[PDB]
């Protein structure tokens, strides 16, 4: 046997992140502000890249999963926490988008608890 | 400006119902074309209108007739259809609200009498 290769596969935790955690969040009513990277020019957002130096969004997390960018579920959880905290840092605490982020994070934390 | 049975209906039934709808919020206040980065908005929309302005006009007895209030709704909805693409999300929101608008207006009292 010259080449004992086998097809690339995700871990059970990474498969869970994709088919359960992200699927559930993407379907949530308040997830749509998090589908794409923040466009600070289009959205007229002062100082966004000055304050938020590691941008993250669910579209990027989704695609990193579908393109096998991740090698461990912990990296995917870190991207999710970066997404939520960026939104908490930049916006005012009473802003709707923060309450939306908080609602998604609760479901995220609840789903990660259910994980193997 | 007057208080009428029909304008009372527009304030206490039509606006009340529409304001609570899940898709009503983009219509709560005038479009701020500078803040939202829509630099062509006022070259395309000559007569802005929004449901917050309608609500205040009802509250300040601005209208002489519910006919004028309904025109304001028509202006708000058709401004949205003109400015935006037929597949934009805000257009589907406007269509949902206009559908409820139509069902409430159908039950408006047919004769307008001043209070």
């Amino acid at each position: 046997v010259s080449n004992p290769s086998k097809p690339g596969r995700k871990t059970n935790q990474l498969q869970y992140m994709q088919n359960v955690v992200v699927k559930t969040l993407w379907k949530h009513q308040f997830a749509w502000p998090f589908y794409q990277p923040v466009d600070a020019i289009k959205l007229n957002l002062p100082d966004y890249h000055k304050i938020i130096k590691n941008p993250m969004d669910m579209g990027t997390i989704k695609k990193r999963l579908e393109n096998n960018y991740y090698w461990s579920a912990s990296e995917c959880m870190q991207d999710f926490n970066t997404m939520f905290t960026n939104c908490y840092i930049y916006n005012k605490p009473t802003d709707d988008i923060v309450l939306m982020a908080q609602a998604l994070e609760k479901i995220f934390l609840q789903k990660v608890a259910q994980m193997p | 400006g007057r208080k009428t049975n029909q304008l009372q209906y527009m304030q206490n039934v039509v606006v009340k119902t529409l304001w609570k709808h899940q898709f009503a919020w983009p219509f709560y206040q005038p479009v701020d074309a500078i803040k939202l980065n829509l630099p062509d908005y006022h070259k395309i929309i000559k007569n802005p209108m929004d449901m917050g302005t309608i609500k205040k006009r009802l509250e300040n007895n601005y209208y002489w007739s519910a006919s004028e209030c309904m025109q304001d709704f028509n202006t708000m909805f058709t401004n949205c259809y003109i400015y935006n693409k037929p597949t934009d999300d805000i257009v589907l929101m406007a269509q949902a609200l206009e559908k409820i608008f139509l069902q409430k207006v159908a039950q408006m009292p047919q004769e307008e009498v001043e209070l």
Binding site: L43, L45 | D32
Partner: peptide, 11 residues
Amino acid sequence: EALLLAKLYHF
């Protein structure tokens, strides 16, 4: 407000 509108973001 504005940011969600952009409407959500700008309240």
